[PDB]
Design a protein around this ligand. Structure first.
Ligand code: NA
Length: 112
């Protein structure tokens, strides 16, 4: 169900918060943004409106990994000590799995 996979991707990997306001310790432990479970060893959050992320797949057909053509601001929450994280940010391209027009999986930072 590609729309629901997209919803899971949005929740897990796209943040509506600014780089400054984003808080790894809150979000990584908040069920609302962690549909695979809380306190994971790593996660990459894309600071973007959903449209531009979705348009990574604009020319995608079937199931295929696509690189973004532009860079995104990214927060990495990593290396938890009792679910308390190192937090850092950078800009980079991203590599996602598209199912048709829908991002359904975060593959890697950088190009595919
Ligand atoms: Na960069």
């Amino acid at each position: 169900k590609e729309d629901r996979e997209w919803e899971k991707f949005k929740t897990k990997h796209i943040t509506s918060q600014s780089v400054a306001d984003f808080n790894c310790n809150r979000t990584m432990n908040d069920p609302a943004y962690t549909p695979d479970g809380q306190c994971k060893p790593i996660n990459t959050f894309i600071h973007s409106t959903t449209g531009p992320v979705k348009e990574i797949c604009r020319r995608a057909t079937g199931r295929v990994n696509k690189s973004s053509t532009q860079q995104f601001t990214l927060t990495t929450c990593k290396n938890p000590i009792r679910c308390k994280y190192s937090q850092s940010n950078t800009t980079n391209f991203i590599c996602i799995t598209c199912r048709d027009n829908y991002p359904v999986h975060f593959v890697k930072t950088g190009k595919c």
